[PDB]
Symmetry: D3
Subunit: 220 residues, 6 copies
Amino acid sequence: MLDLLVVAPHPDDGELGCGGTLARAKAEGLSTGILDLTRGEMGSKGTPEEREKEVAEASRILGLDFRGNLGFPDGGLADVPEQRLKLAQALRRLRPRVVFAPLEADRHPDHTAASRLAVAAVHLAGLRKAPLEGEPFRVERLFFYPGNHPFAPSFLVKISAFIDQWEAAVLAYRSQFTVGPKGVEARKAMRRYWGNYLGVDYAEPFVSPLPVLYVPWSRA
Amino acid sequence: MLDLLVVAPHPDDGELGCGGTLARAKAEGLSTGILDLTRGEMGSKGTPEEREKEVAEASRILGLDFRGNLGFPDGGLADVPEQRLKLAQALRRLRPRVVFAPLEADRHPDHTAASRLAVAAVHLAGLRKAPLEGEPFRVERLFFYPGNHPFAPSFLVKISAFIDQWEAAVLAYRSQFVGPKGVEARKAMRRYWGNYLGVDYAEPFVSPLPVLYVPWSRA
Amino acid sequence: MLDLLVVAPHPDDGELGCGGTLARAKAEGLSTGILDLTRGEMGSKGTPEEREKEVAEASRILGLDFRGNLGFPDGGLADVPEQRLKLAQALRRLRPRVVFAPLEADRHPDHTAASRLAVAAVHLAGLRKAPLEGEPFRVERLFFYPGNHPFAPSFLVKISAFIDQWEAAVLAYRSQFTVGPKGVEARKAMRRYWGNYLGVDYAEPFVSPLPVLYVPWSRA
Amino acid sequence: MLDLLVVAPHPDDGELGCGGTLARAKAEGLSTGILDLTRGEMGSKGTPEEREKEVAEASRILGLDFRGNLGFPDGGLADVPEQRLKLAQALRRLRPRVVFAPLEADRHPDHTAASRLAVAAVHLAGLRKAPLEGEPFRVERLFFYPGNHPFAPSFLVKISAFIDQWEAAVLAYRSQFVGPKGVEARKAMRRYWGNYLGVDYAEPFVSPLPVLYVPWSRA
Amino acid sequence: MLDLLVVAPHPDDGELGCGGTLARAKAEGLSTGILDLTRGEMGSKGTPEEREKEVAEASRILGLDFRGNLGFPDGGLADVPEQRLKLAQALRRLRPRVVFAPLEADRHPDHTAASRLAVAAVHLAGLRKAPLEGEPFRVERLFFYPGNHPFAPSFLVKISAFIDQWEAAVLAYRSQFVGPKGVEARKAMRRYWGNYLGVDYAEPFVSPLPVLYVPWSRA
Amino acid sequence: MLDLLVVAPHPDDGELGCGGTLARAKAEGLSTGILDLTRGEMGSKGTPEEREKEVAEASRILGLDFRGNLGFPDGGLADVPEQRLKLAQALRRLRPRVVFAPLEADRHPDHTAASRLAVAAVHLAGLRKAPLEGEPFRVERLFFYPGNHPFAPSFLVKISAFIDQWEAAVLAYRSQFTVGPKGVEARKAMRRYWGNYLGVDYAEPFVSPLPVLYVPWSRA
């Protein structure tokens, strides 16, 4: 089990969208992970060892217990049977209580496809008769993180104390952000802007197709 | 302070909209209230005398720390200075951490006016220089409960353990029972919304702002 | 011709979404049907004979003239050429004046795919040069019924006198609802809740991408 | 009773928005009317004398059973008790089964106010205890017709056979002809919306509630 | 005429919302102004004397051709005839080709009222028969600037070269600095929205109508 | 480079959606083009020469510098690797500053698929490591034109002086509009209706997922 798993199209994308929240969950004692669907080979600069080192350093900064990769083709993500079944099999193994996956609305077709894959795989992982190994597992909560298209957030997660971890894990991708340095500062401004609506220094936006079960007097 | 106050246009409306959530807050040990803006004269198909007993019975069922009325005219709620100022004064007196007010979209213009009134009053209550008595107070959270029009909820509050209190408090208005099929339908709303999220009953609310949520937190 | 055809991803799903309206159309003398795209084999419990018997009993309760199945793979519905063409061929044969198909917004990828299949097949069935047998046929009205995601209905159909048929045809799937019993009572509450907005005991919601041609003084 | 009443802010507005539908209702044998809330003084680029003839000509073309005016101030429509109460009184006098009122979203604040007025008046007219004369009456259906702002229609009414009456009734306002290109554009609206649904012309309306529709019924 | 006028509920609000765009207009040689509807008495945590200097400093930074105030009551903005008519009169005096006004959706009821006021006043100012002095004037474009509530922008104005003027003009309100983190957040808004469109900073606006755009034109 | 390229599912569809704007851009001295994804063979009447002649005449009327076809199957458009890569390769060759592609919301599945293809191809064309020939090229602006589903336009383009060219290029498809004559007059009424909201005789609606960079005082 993971308390929280982020499914990302390639390495750096889970960090970009969810780093603050992942760092917070770790601080609160949760076991966290990122599953990357591809190795980002159509956008990566650097040797296998160099890209691997950035992932290890980002994972360290955020305090992930789990980091894995499905090795699907970069630029070839698609909601097709083979990818659906392999993600669903990973979900039964990982048993995540909460999953974050990319929001469908995006300029990058891999994000849209990851989004659809997570939906279909969550459903499949839960089916008694799905052609998969192991016990059926039903993800309790699936939320989506925005990428490069505007969105109307369903909720935000306060991450004020975790902003420097968010930023350091993204900047760990030195071959990528040294989206670039301007991309990073834009996503930091997103967090500052959204958080200020709710009276906090920084917050990370998420979308849910369902209204959340919220306790209106609970702490931020 | 109250931990939670429901502002309602006429008695029975706060219960109708938020009774399950009010009962849950009370069970969790919070201080709760309903402030009614009118006495509901233009609809009270009971006497003023018996209506008084209904309100007390409903308040007891929900375990309200506070029940009050501002005495504005039924059918005449409006976002005008007089009403804004008396509501802002009450908010300063009650110091509610969270307020629920009716959703603007409705067939009943009092609901719509109560909505606007709550917004404007929350604002005025927090202004140092406002023409009001006491210290300025800033309501932390303002959320809206749907009435008789469709809505897209921002969040739901799980109330499965409190559905019977919600229903008993509404039914406390014996003289009222828009209502017998009305109550049925509002219980069906709670069953319907709650099932999306895998719970027996839940009450829907709307926020103009995304809520600050902790996605691994308990329901 | 059918006056009304419901296209469903698997048996029980057309009943769950449209049973009241189907029972009403029958009462009004229309010839009705359900076309199931798959046999529901990845979710079914029971022998071939047992599942077949539930379908026959549900069909009886609703008074369907037509019941058929395309035998596509359960969990494998997709808007791909082979499925598109086979549904389109069924539509030319059936000649439905009105078709109901699942709404795209759903946790179950088969519903979303059925939705897209119905759209594409309606278009194909209408084409002179489509590689299909028989006379081109243009479905006059295509509406969508909600599944398990929230929706904003375009219209409702009053079904107060048909609620017990709706419920009995769903409960005919004894291996399934004995979604479960709680699922059924939730969909019954949907109907009660939606109907009460419009002053009726029960009503079934539908979505149309087009505004409907409505007569504002006509009877409910 | 009327079967159908259009509430309009100034004369020509009801025709502009709903003339095809009014003519169809009449052809199907229904009793129809327009109630104008103002005389349109602040825009009447004709005389009050000639405007009277235009209104009568337009009413005749559409076959209205009832034409009236409430005499509220042009440019001063507002959802205030005085106006609410006089409109609610007229609704009780006319007992319309279906009312059409302007859509709220508009550049002209009278349209917006007429919208709110209709909502509040429908409500008041149905209240036993309202300060009004006669029996309480509950309008069955309230729908809204778009003005000069974009809208997402809830439904369309097929008016292909009635397009010429719609156009003749609008053109009846000779002194008016915002308008010559205005009329052209509103006829193009009807052509455009109607084509989505495979008909020559249709008039769009908005409902806050999904309509009770019979999906195999005739257009 | 002005080429561009920003109508703001209290001083600092026009700058907060539209300062980058105002500075750009000025750099391109347009005539610009801010008309404040109130003096912001109910919030001015400086003196009236020092507030006067702040407004002048902010106006100078942005290069405004016109700065004025209508003296309406802070916290009492309302879409009522008195206020409508005085605003419509000012629009006739200023003849602005483009007006910016606050977006309706807000926690502060003055923003909401200023929005409605601008709509109604634009309309009245253009009416031959309106009870106003001077020639009728028709504002060509009316757009809305967001305040403290979320919004979906219709368009953005690239202001990368003007971000420092925007910030200096807001900071000119020394006595004010809702604000220090407020300013930071509004600069972050501009960074965030601007990045969607590949520019350093941009200011968002809302139009109820699609804009007339030339899709190969320069930013 | 083209200043403006319209990507259309079949010949006549770019003209129907964008003709006015294309004619305007030409008048203003821009180099314009239409890339048709298919040859419209499942909807065309007439010989290869006849259909070819209509395209040449429409292209003439609008003043296109470029007219091309990718030869994908009519009724078989899909966001699949082969179609994605071939459109992306065409975009790198053409180097369009501004591209218009069909809006996703449509009854015709080819429009929806063209829409998704343009998005994915714009992304691919811009990638250093995409398996394509030639210099990476990043389309600056991608907008969408409505087809047969309602829409909420993001902007309109004033085309009052170009309405007769728009209409003549559509009517050049004599085998098609002699959608038919009624279809044409409906799209002309769309332009008249939308333009009147903004005080112009005719305007063509477009959608953008991003707010546009607009100069609020600029000329229409």
